[PDB]
């Protein structure tokens, strides 16, 4: 339906953060392929800034960057996921805040993302 | 602490019934359902549909939480609304999570204990 991307992406990103098998889902396989869109180096830099800032501020700044196409969208999804993976599960982050910004920027592309990844 | 991600996953699950394996944490969280009065959810769902929005849910979530009892009840009402509103509902759940958590995050420790003691 397209609107299903919201719940899926929330589940995906949180799963990337703690890698708890309980919350594994086949559909994540396709989403992980997006990892190649972002440089592992940019992620490391972002993680460092989050760590010295002791907060999600830098992640939120990156999420607030404009998105003009579906490729930019995939990128933001990929950076959120890679950051969730490298920041670690002990990280006390109010994920709903990142989700709010993320979706504010990519929701409009939900339908095209669904067909592009599951079509 | 991990209550945050747990509750997000629990509420989304209550909405679409999607999971791959048995979830013992979800079973324990569902026990909270008994705290919700009959009709309460029904009325909430009704108002959400009349307004075509999550406003009524947000209103309910903005009410004061004075004790762990209230915090548990707010979790249950959110879960029950999620289940009865239907998965097709285009709700931006992250906004309800924001209100829910600012209202009950202090009780995360008690909940973490109250659930697994």
UniProtKB/Swiss-Prot annotation, chain A:
GO terms for biological process: symbiont-mediated perturbation of host apoptosis; symbiont-mediated perturbation of host defense response; symbiont-mediated suppression of host NF-kappaB cascade. Pfam families: Poxv_Bcl-2-like. Keywords: Early protein, Host-virus interaction, Inhibition of host NF-kappa-B by virus, Modulation of host cell apoptosis by virus, Viral immunoevasion. The keyword Disulfide bond does not apply. Induction: Expressed in the early phase of the viral replicative cycle. The keyword Protein transport does not apply. It comes from the Viruses. Coiled coil: none annotated. Gene3D superfamilies: dsDNA poxvirus. Belongs to the poxviridae OPG035 family. Bcl-2-like protein which contributes to virulence by preventing host NF-kappa-B activation in response to pro-inflammatory stimuli such as TNF-alpha or IL1B. This is Protein OPG035. It comes from Vaccinia virus (strain Copenhagen).
């Amino acid at each position: 339906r397209g609107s299903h991307m919201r719940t899926l992406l929330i589940r995906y990103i949180l799963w990337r953060n703690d890698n708890d098998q309980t919350y594994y889902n086949d559909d994540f396989k396709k989403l992980m392929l997006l990892d190649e869109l972002v440089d592992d180096g940019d992620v490391c830099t972002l993680i460092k800034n989050m760590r010295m800032t002791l907060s999600d501020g830098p992640l939120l700044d990156r999420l607030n960057q404009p998105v003009n196409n579906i490729e930019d969208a995939k990128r933001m999804i990929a950076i959120s996921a890679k950051v969730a993976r490298d920041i670690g599960e002990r990280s006390e982050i109010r994920w709903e805040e990142s989700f709010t910004i993320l979706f504010r920027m990519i929701e409009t592309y939900f339908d095209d993302l669904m067909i592009d990844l599951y079509g």
